[PDB]
Design a protein around this ligand. Structure first.
Ligand SMILES: [Zn+2]
Ligand SMILES: [Zn+2]
Ligand SMILES: [Zn+2]
Length: 178
């Protein structure tokens, strides 16, 4: 196994996957690394199994159909994995914890949103459709763009949104377009 967390790239108290060489901090894995379970298989491994069980699941999909899917166990897992892929980028730090807004010439968003809030909402099974999760995720970046206006810090929201969107298209096998 690797000697650093796959998500935050630091050493520490690491749980090792039994079916691949990745390792994780307890609360860096999503869901949090399960108490017992020997062998244990990471989310990466669980996602790859879904694909292997149903090879046709990789054929292209329309975004509108994916959003309307109910949050059954496989879709729950795919959203957890997508959330984890965003935490994998170090720029996710800016979006992880609860924000506050006090900048001359700007007003805070009407509905603040942040990664740890989405993480708790997934854990608490608060989303009934993929659309709920995706809407909260895109709201994080949209709030940031609107609040920061012409400050160059706006770019951090474009960057992390791009990570989200690329992973969304990969995980949910969105039909490729120009
Ligand atoms: Zn970690
Ligand atoms: Zn694994
Ligand atoms: Zn099948």
């Amino acid at each position: 196994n690797s000697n650093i967390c796959e998500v935050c790239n630091k050493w520490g108290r690491l749980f090792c996957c039994d079916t691949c060489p990745r390792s994780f901090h307890e609360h860096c894995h999503i869901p949090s690394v399960e108490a017992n379970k020997n062998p244990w298989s990471c989310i990466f491994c669980r996602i790859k199994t879904i694909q292997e069980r149903c090879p046709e699941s990789q054929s292209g999909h329309q975004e509108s159909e994916v959003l309307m899917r109910q949050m059954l166990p496989e879709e729950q897992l795919k959203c957890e994995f997508l959330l984890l892929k965003v935490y994998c980028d170090s720029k996710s730090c800016f979006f992880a914890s609860e924000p506050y807004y006090n900048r001359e010439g700007s007003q805070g968003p009407q509905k603040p949103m942040w990664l740890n809030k989405v993480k708790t909402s997934l854990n608490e099974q608060m989303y009934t459709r993929v659309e709920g999760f995706v809407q909260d995720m895109r709201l994080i970046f949209h709030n940031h763009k609107e609040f920061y206006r012409e400050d160059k810090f706006t770019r951090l929201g474009i960057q992390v949104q791009d990570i989200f969107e690329k992973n969304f298209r990969n995980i949910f096998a969105i039909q490729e377009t120009s």
